[PDB]
Design an enzyme around this catalytic site. Structure first.
Site, PDB file in Angstrom:
ATOM      1  CB  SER A   3      -5.353  -7.993  -1.989  1.00 39.64           C
ATOM      2  OG  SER A   3      -4.254  -7.667  -2.827  1.00 39.64           O
ATOM      3  CD  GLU A  34      -6.415  -0.059  -3.345  1.00 36.59           C
ATOM      4  OE1 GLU A  34      -5.631  -0.695  -2.607  1.00 36.59           O
ATOM      5  OE2 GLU A  34      -7.655  -0.158  -3.253  1.00 36.59           O
ATOM      6  CG  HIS A  38      -3.440  -3.009  -1.207  1.00 36.13           C
ATOM      7  ND1 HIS A  38      -4.534  -3.135  -2.040  1.00 36.13           N
ATOM      8  CD2 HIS A  38      -2.886  -4.244  -1.128  1.00 36.13           C
ATOM      9  CE1 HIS A  38      -4.628  -4.387  -2.454  1.00 36.13           C
ATOM     10  NE2 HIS A  38      -3.640  -5.080  -1.916  1.00 36.13           N
TER      11      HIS A  38
HETATM   12  C1  LIG Z   1      -3.123  -8.519  -2.618  1.00 36.61           C
HETATM   13  C2  LIG Z   1      -2.266  -8.553  -3.884  1.00 36.61           C
HETATM   14  O1  LIG Z   1      -3.496  -9.892  -2.480  1.00 36.61           O
HETATM   15  C3  LIG Z   1      -2.122  -7.883  -1.644  1.00 36.61           C
HETATM   16  C4  LIG Z   1      -2.596  -8.024  -0.195  1.00 36.61           C
HETATM   17  C5  LIG Z   1      -1.557  -7.485   0.799  1.00 36.61           C
HETATM   18  N1  LIG Z   1      -1.819  -7.434   2.255  1.00 36.61           N
HETATM   19  C6  LIG Z   1      -0.590  -6.913   2.884  1.00 36.61           C
HETATM   20  C7  LIG Z   1      -2.922  -6.530   2.633  1.00 36.61           C
HETATM   21  C8  LIG Z   1      -2.007  -8.739   2.911  1.00 36.61           C
END
Ligand SMILES: *[C@](C)(O)CCC[N+](C)(C)C
Ligand SMILES: *[C@@H]1O[C@H](CO)[C@@H](O)[C@H](O)[C@H]1NC(C)=O
Ligand SMILES: *[C@@H]1O[C@H](CO)[C@@H](O)[C@H](O)[C@H]1NC(C)=O
Ligand SMILES: *[C@@H]1O[C@H](CO)[C@@H](O)[C@H](O)[C@H]1NC(C)=O
Ligand SMILES: *[C@@H]1O[C@H](CO)[C@@H](O)[C@H](O)[C@H]1NC(C)=O
Ligand SMILES: *[C@](C)(O)CCC[N+](C)(C)C
Ligand SMILES: CC(=O)CCC[N+](C)(C)C
Ligand SMILES: CC(=O)CCC[N+](C)(C)C
Ligand SMILES: [Cl-]
Ligand SMILES: [Cl-]
Ligand SMILES: [Cl-]
Ligand SMILES: [Cl-]
Lengths: 528, 532
Positions: free
Chosen positions: A197, A324, A437
């Site tokens: 992410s 996602e 996600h």
């Molecule tokens: C990404 C936008 O950085 C989201 C990551 C979310 N988690 C819950 C997997 C940490």
């Protein structure tokens, strides 16, 4: 000693840890920068001044100050992502897992957590690096960096709060690995940075930034790319948000110094409490303080850099998960619930797309709507749900990543793409959310290898081949050891599915929708 | 004497024609207007003035002056649509078929030929009305009207060339049927007007125009509706084309009077030769002289008229054919051929879309392209060919008709929709063209009932049920015969939007004919093009 290591900044004492009926070395909470507290808040990181004596590196460090999700108290699904230790602005540390006995010049993998740049910790159970380091015999490093206003408040022009300090923290951690990993058995010339992410977006941004390129060899991006719509903002937008943060906290807004001095007097929780109030629209998958295109860390716009090939040329391995979008719909879109199938009415669907594409005009919204609505059965709640699911995932993750994969491949030295679509058998989230996600992470870190977690035998084998693909790639630039994971090329554009069934090769991952998101819609919003 | 009939305009003598082992009365070439020649050219039609003696109505009349298709010399597939009689500006006549013995006051059906408003004849073999009139026992009328510049040159303001005169010619033939059809055994209170393509648009235009409404009971539209993109132009575009025609002939363009006077001195073939040069852009399924939204024949915009229910409220039966665009792609799109599979390259696909939607900006083009392109296999020649076929068919015929049906049904008193998708076993056109624009007509007129034509037994049955559907609808306003055993053709409702397929297989009821694409053409694209 095997646990006593002398680094360029001082001595550190690790700790012998158990792992799959064996052991490995673990060095937790090693400081890589001076605590960014007091007058150092919002300011670029400063290298950690040497220390005398032995540093106790036997326990995890504090997590950075961040918003804490309390939507579902006690629910492991959401809590596994929350800080599992004291939060503090003094949070710039890193962790290392070394196989025992200590190898020589072995491959190094550096993990960068995600969390939309507003959250994340290096100490989460799912990021426990002992299984991967052991099983694959690599030196695994997990770093940390400031999130939220603390790491991304941007007031371009000022040197007290220039923006991107969170990214600079990441760089200083990599610089530290470059200078000290050799003392732990790692080969600083063979370092692979990987993240999910926001972490994936970070890995990508380091590939673009001239100042980071020489700090690593190869990269892995999981469900995130530098060009994601939520991953960055202009200096102008960064300034507006920064100023609106001050306003929310009744700050003197006459000048940057006055604004900054005010914000530096506030307690951490005061900033966080109003963090979300600076967003320009009602939306989902959008975060307040993120990296800024400053013309410094990022020479020029991300796109121009990608078209000109102005970035590190090496091997990359990246991919996305099947669903996602579900996680973010659940938290910010009407009609969604953790305890129901979440059939979405037509009215909520409409509301959802608006939330998903806050920047679009009405014509743009109509375009997205038509693109994702089956008009032979528009009042089908399941289709409206899945449709919204795809809209969020395609726009925010998948398509931005495909745009990145296609641009990079023209100059890169090897691309490997994947589509993770396995639904964990012991998932605590409802079925409608699908392959969520962030849930491929547990497989990348070998969690399925521990009996107590109750994963199926097929998932353990899956986790084992995933770790081996990642590790093998880290050390050679090819996930296959001499079913072969084909090389993504501009022509054939191949990728593989990542699940419990025998490998399957496909071409043009969601090309139809991504043509819409990467070409038509942008053109439409520019013309109207 | 069955064959001797005296009308309000004078006596007429028909002829006995054989038909499927029996016989029927035929009155061919009856005049309903004064020859629109000389100073009459471009002018509103005038009632045929009374004549003395007996008018010999045993042979077909001349066809109106028109462009003649010479793409495939000798090829029946194309020539079956060309004039089969001598062309002349003196062409305003009508034909009538009457069951024998002469009925007392039976159902009447009036046929309005199509041909893009630039061609068409009431005399084609495929329009021979003896089979239908005889099998369903109805009085079948075949009218004619001026096409091309002769029938649609429009210079709003002038009373010499006001425009829509071709539509006025149709109205005058309807006025004639209203005043004289009773003398042939039909009921002027029960007249159904039906037409295909331009003929279909026409019928829809009479349903809309206040001056035509009381001249018929019900209506049937085949592959054509009034709101079609090619069926009309604004008064401004009409003037532009009118003036452009004069410029193409070195005409004095100082005023309408001089312009019109110049065009009236020209020979028929002279106007026709340059007819196509007045078009705005390179295109397909676009015609030079068509009806104009004048504020007279048409009170206000067709759309505002459809939204306010400002039109005749009755029963209507309409539909389309599976492959509406193939015929036009063959004639004006690169990569298409009559003697090949016509696999379309990506390059030619792009060119075709530009051709198919000539009024679209670059953004509108990308939208169309994206909507009809399978990006997982964009170089597939077949998908590219079929995609173009659907583009042309959906934009020009299907979606405009769906728009019409959905708007009409909100105020109408009965809608029946069909989807003709049967490829005749004896088609002379290539397989890729599929179910061609206009090839349902032969089934409507019972051609499949004549053995020498070599249609299959199942095609004869199809023709018979289609003729029965049309006739029964003409008589009662419902294609279905009450308390009969056969499957029922359901009504089209705003809610369920039902429609049936029309082929040799048992009836199938479907819903929302091509909603996906039509939402694109009727809602999204217009909004996009309107933006800036
Ligand atoms: C990404 C936008 O950085 C989201 C990551 C979310 N988690 C819950 C997997 C940490
Ligand atoms: C390091 O810290 C841990 C936990 O606070 C403690 O148990 C350990 O004794 C410390 N190291 C030593 C032996 O000084
Ligand atoms: C990577 O670069 C080397 C030499 O720089 C070249 O031989 C090799 O083919 C490249 N690999 C790919 C797939 O780009
Ligand atoms: C009417 O025309 C037909 C066809 O030419 C001809 O056979 C017939 O004798 C004509 N009738 C008369 C008496 O004029
Ligand atoms: C048509 O109009 C009649 C008379 O008002 C009415 O009784 C009938 O229900 C209508 N039928 C339809 C299908 O609208
Ligand atoms: C319609 C545009 O009027 C086309 C009619 C064409 N034929 C070939 C069926 C007469
Ligand atoms: C997935 C998340 O916790 C989104 C953040 C929720 N608020 C906007 C309500 C703070
Ligand atoms: C639909 C038509 O056959 C078009 C007439 C042919 N030209 C454009 C070439 C004159
Ligand atoms: Cl364990
Ligand atoms: Cl805690
Ligand atoms: Cl390549
Ligand atoms: Cl519609």
């Amino acid at each position: 000693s095997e646990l006593l290591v002398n680094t360029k900044s001082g001595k550190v004492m690790g700790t012998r840890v158990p792992v799959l009926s064996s052991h490995i070395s673990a060095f937790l909470g090693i400081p890589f920068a001076e605590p960014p507290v007091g007058n150092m808040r919002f300011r670029r990181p400063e290298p950690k001044k040497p220390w005398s004596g032995v540093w106790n590196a036997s326990t995890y460090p504090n997590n950075c100050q961040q918003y804490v999700d309390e939507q579902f108290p006690g629910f492991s699904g959401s809590e596994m992502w929350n800080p599992n230790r004291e939060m503090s602005e003094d949070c710039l540390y890193l962790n290392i897992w070394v196989p025992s006995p200590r190898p020589k010049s072995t491959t190094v993998m550096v993990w960068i957590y995600g969390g939309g740049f507003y959250s994340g910790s290096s100490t989460l159970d799912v990021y426990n690096g002992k299984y991967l380091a052991y099983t694959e015999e690599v030196v695994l490093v997990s770093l940390s960096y400031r999130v939220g206003a603390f790491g991304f408040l941007a007031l371009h022009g000022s040197q007290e709060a220039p923006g991107n300090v969170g990214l600079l923290d990441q760089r200083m951690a990599l610089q530290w690995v470059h200078d000290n990993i050799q003392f732990f058995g790692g080969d600083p010339k063979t370092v692979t940075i990987f993240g999910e992410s926001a972490g994936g977006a970070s890995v990508g941004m380091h590939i673009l930034s001239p100042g980071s390129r020489d700090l690593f060899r190869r990269a892995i991006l999981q469900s995130g790319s530098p060009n994601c719509p939520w991953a960055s903002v202009s200096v102008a937008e960064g300034r507006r948000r920064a100023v609106e943060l001050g306003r929310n906290l009744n700050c003197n807004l006459n000048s940057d110094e006055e604004l900054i001095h005010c914000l530096r007097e506030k307690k951490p929780q005061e900033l966080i409490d109003v963090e979300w109030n600076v967003l320009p629209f009602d939306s989902i998958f959008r975060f307040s303080f993120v990296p800024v295109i400053d013309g410094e860390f990022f020479p020029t716009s991300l796109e121009s850099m990608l078209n000109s090939g102005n970035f590190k040329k090496t091997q990359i391995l990246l991919g996305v998960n099947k669903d996602e979008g579900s996680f973010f719909l659940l938290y910010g879109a009407p009609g969604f619930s953790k305890d129901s199938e979440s059939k979405i009415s037509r009215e909520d669907f409409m509301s959802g797309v608006k939330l998903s594409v806050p920047h679009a005009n009405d014509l743009g919204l109509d375009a997205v709507t038509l693109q994702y609505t089956d008009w032979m059965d528009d009042n089908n709640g399941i289709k409206n749900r899945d449709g919204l699911d795809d809209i969020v995932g395609d726009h925010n993750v998948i398509c931005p990543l495909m745009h990145f994969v296609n641009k990079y491949t023209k100059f890169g030295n090897g691309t490997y793409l994947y589509f993770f679509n396995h639904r964990a058998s012991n998932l605590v989230w409802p079925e409608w959310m699908g392959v969520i996600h962030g849930y491929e992470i547990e497989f990348v870190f070998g969690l399925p290898l521990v009996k107590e977690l109750n994963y199926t035998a097929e998932e353990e084998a899956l986790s084992r081949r995933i770790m081996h693909y990642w590790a093998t790639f880290a050390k050679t630039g090819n996930p296959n050891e001499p079913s072969k994971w084909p090389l993504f090329t501009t022509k054939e554009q191949k990728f593989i599915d990542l699940n419990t069934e025998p490998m399957k090769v496909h071409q043009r991952l969601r090309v139809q929708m991504c043509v819409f998101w990467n070409q038509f819609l942008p053109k439409l919003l520019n013309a109207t």
